[PDB]
Amino acid sequence: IIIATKNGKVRGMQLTVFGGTVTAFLGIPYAQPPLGRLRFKKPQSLTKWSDIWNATKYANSCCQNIDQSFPGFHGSEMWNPNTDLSEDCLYLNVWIPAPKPKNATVLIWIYGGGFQTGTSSLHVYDGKFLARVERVIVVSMNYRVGALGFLALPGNPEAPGNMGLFDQQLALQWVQKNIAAFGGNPKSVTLFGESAGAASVSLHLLSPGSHSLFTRAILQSGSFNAPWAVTSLYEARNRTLNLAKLTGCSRENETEIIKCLRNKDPQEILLNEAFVVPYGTPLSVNFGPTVDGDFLTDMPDILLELGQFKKTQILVGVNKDEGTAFLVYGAPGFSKDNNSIITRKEFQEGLKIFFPGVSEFGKESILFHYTDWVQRPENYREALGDVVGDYNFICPALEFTKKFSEWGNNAFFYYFEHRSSKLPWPEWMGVMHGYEIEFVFGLPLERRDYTKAEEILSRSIVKRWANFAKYGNPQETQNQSTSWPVFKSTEQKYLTLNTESTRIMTKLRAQQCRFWTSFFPKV
Numbered sequence: 001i002i003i004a005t006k007n008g009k010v011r012g013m014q015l016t017v018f019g020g021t022v023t024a025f026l027g028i029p030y031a032q033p034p035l036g037r038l039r040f041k042k043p044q045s046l047t048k049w050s051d052i053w054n055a056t057k058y059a060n061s062c063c064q065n066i067d068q069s070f071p072g073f074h075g076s077e078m079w080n081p082n083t084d085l086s087e088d089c090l091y092l093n094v095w096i097p098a099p100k101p102k103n104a105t106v107l108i109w110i111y112g113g114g115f116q117t118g119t120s121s122l123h124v125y126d127g128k129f130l131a132r133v134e135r136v137i138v139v140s141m142n143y144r145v146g147a148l149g150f151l152a153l154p155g156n157p158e159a160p161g162n163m164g165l166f167d168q169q170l171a172l173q174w175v176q177k178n179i180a181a182f183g184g185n186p187k188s189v190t191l192f193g194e195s196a197g198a199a200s201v202s203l204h205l206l207s208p209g210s211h212s213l214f215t216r217a218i219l220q221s222g223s224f225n226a227p228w229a230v231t232s233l234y235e236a237r238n239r240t241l242n243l244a245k246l247t248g249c250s251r252e253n254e255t256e257i258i259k260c261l262r263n264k265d266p267q268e269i270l271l272n273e274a275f276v277v278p279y280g281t282p283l284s285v286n287f288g289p290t291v292d293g294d295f296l297t298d299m300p301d302i303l304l305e306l307g308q309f310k311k312t313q314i315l316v317g318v319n320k321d322e323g324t325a326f327l328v329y330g331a332p333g334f335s336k337d338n339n340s341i342i343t344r345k346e347f348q349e350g351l352k353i354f355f356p357g358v359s360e361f362g363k364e365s366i367l368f369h370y371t372d373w374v375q376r377p378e379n380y381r382e383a384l385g386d387v388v389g390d391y392n393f394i395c396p397a398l399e400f401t402k403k404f405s406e407w408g409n410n411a412f413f414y415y416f417e418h419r420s421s422k423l424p425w426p427e428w429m430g431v432m433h434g435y436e437i438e439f440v441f442g443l444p445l446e447r448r449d450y451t452k453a454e455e456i457l458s459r460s461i462v463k464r465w466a467n468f469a470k471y472g473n474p475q476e477t478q479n480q481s482t483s484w485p486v487f488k489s490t491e492q493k494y495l496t497l498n499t500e501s502t503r504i505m506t507k508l509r510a511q512q513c514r515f516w517t518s519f520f521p522k523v
């Protein structure tokens with residue numbers, strides 16, 4: 001049907017889902033296309049239109065480099081943009097239950113992709129299942145990534161930094177001002193994302209400007225305190241300048257640098273983003289969030305430590321094998337096409353790839369902590385993966401949770417350990433980074449595809465995620481399920497998610513994280 005929004009009318013399309021119907025509005029604009037003089041600037045308000053805007057298909061995805069490491073492989077290509085790339089990419093999608101709901105809780109998705117890639121139109125971010133099954137309204141948006149989204153010149157409005165985060169914020173505002181018209185409750189909005197998406201959600205919890213645009217938060221495999229999540233003002237400057245040189249835009253006047261960069265084609269900017277860093281890693285985030293003094297008013301770690309953040313409930317979690325996915329993008333001896341049994345020497349070279357500017361002592365300390373074998377040919381293969389996963393995702397997430405809960409709010413932590421039966425990647429990579437997503441969005445609820453055990457697991461996660469959003473408590477109260485306990489700094493209880501048996505456990509990776517959280521920061 002047609003919904004009247006603050007800026008004009010929009011037309012959706014009906015979709016058949018599980019013997020029912022969901023109304024989708026794909027591609028609603030929420031900001032002025034950031035083209036020309038508007039490139040690198042915070043998103044500007046949109047101008048009211050007349051006629052009926054047709055939101056019947058996904059809009060353009062934002063400019064970004066694509067993963068070409070495995071042409072023709074679904075494992076990597078399922079994450080690549082499935083929509084035309086373009087600077088004109090500030091659009092959002094809405095899925096609403098049918099018949100129209102009266103005051104439905106709203107779930108807003110923020111995709112990940114290291115702040116360099118990603119898009120809301122991916123097959124695995126389809127919100128129709130959630131709308132259909134739990135009667136919630138699902139919203140997702142495209143936000144600028146890479147240099148076009150995070151290039152920074154602190155203090156300069158021509159390129160202030162964090163533009164992609166402000167894109168996200170403008171979309172949350174759109175929901176605040178328009179979701180009622182779709183039958184949604186702007187007072188019951190839960191943000192949820194994965195990877196850089198999760199890091200973005202955690203930053204919205206810290207940004208005063210986002211405080212009133214949402215109720216609760218869900219962080220899947222990511223938080224701002226991850227080593228790859230925030231670019232230092234130092235790195236940012238060197239990077240903006242390196243990009244300038246590489247494009248022949250170096251100028252005495254910094255604003256002239258930007259004007260120059262505003263004449264380059266999106267491709268020239270994308271082509272040179274990779275080289276702005278002397279030596280990067282398969283986890284490098286060339287252009288990401290920075291302390292801009294606007295969206296972020298101080299180093300986020302300080303804000304977290306001193307309780308300066310939105311007080312509300314949070315649901316946080318990570319996957320069993322967060323690090324494996326990155327091993328095949330640079331680690332010697334690794335390949336998705338063999339068991340990747342590596343040697344001590346390869347493990348050591350591996351650390352060089354993942355910890356480039358780290359002292360020799362720092363790398364030895366990582367090896368000492370992870371090589372105290374408990375024989376087996378895959379010891380080193382498994383150790384490098386845990387090293388990358390604990391350092392980059394698991395430990396930062398736990399620390400974030402512990403620090404956040406220390407200020408009074410209920411927090412729930414999960415450990416996702418189920419390996420999709422349809423995973424394209426080899427078994428040795430295990431429960432990979434990004435592969436709990438399809439379960440959260442309820443893809444396994446669709447029988448035409450996944451085992452029965454997977455349908456049941458996805459059905460529970462969906463119910464838990466929905467109950468969290470609506471009631472702030474991730475329980476599944478009807479089918480004699482394990483109760484999900486609150487996570488406290490003392491006992492640190494967490495729930496495991498799998499098909500076998502869900503369990504309550506305590507102090508995840510206790511020994512490993514003491515190393516990363518307490519010691520490693522010093523080297």
Ligand SMILES: *[C@@H]1O[C@H](CO[C@@H]2O[C@@H](C)[C@@H](O)[C@@H](O)[C@@H]2O)[C@@H](O[C@@H]2O[C@H](CO)[C@@H](O)[C@H](O)[C@H]2NC(C)=O)[C@H](O)[C@H]1NC(C)=O
Binds near residue numbers: 238
């Ligand atoms: C800050 O940037 C300099 C310059 O980086 C180089 O030039 C850029 C345009 C880009 O092309 C990069 O790939 C280049 O590396 C960094 O200095 C470089 O350091 C490396 C050390 O391996 C050296 O080989 C290069 O010759 C240096 N570049 C030059 C010409 O000075 C510098 O390391 C960066 N600062 C940091 C964060 O360390």
Ligand SMILES: *[C@@H]1O[C@H](CO[C@@H]2O[C@@H](C)[C@@H](O)[C@@H](O)[C@@H]2O)[C@@H](O[C@@H]2O[C@H](CO)[C@@H](O)[C@H](O)[C@H]2NC(C)=O)[C@H](O)[C@H]1NC(C)=O
Binds near residue numbers: 332333337338340
């Ligand atoms: C697992 O494969 C890696 C990657 O090698 C490539 O992919 C293979 C499947 C095969 O098609 C090779 O021809 C390709 O080169 C192997 O790593 C290579 O090992 C050789 C010798 O040890 C070394 O010279 C190369 O530099 C390595 N390449 C990389 C990227 O590290 C590895 O040996 C295989 N391990 C097995 C079979 O268990």
Ligand SMILES: *[C@@H]1O[C@H](CO)[C@@H](O)[C@H](O)[C@H]1NC(C)=O
Binds near residue numbers: 011052053054
């Ligand atoms: C929007 O969709 C309607 C109905 O399909 C169509 O009549 C109209 O021309 C469309 N507007 C466009 C393509 O600008």
Ligand SMILES: *[C@@H]1O[C@H](CO)[C@@H](O)[C@H](O)[C@H]1NC(C)=O
Binds near residue numbers: 103188
């Ligand atoms: C939706 O619920 C909120 C409380 O969460 C209430 O304040 C608001 O008036 C309701 N919206 C409707 C149905 O008008």
Ligand SMILES: *[C@@H]1O[C@H](CO)[C@@H](O)[C@H](O)[C@H]1NC(C)=O
Binds near residue numbers: 459460479
């Ligand atoms: C609860 O159990 C019923 C039947 O036993 C099943 O159909 C349903 O999917 C389950 N609900 C949840 C939320 O798991």
Ligand SMILES: C[N+](C)(C)CCO
Binds near residue numbers: 111434
């Ligand atoms: C980070 N994503 C899951 C979005 C892409 C694959 O790593």
Ligand SMILES: [Cl-]
Binds near residue numbers: 077080
């Ligand atoms: Cl492709």
Ligand SMILES: [Cl-]
Binds near residue numbers: 480482
């Ligand atoms: Cl159970």
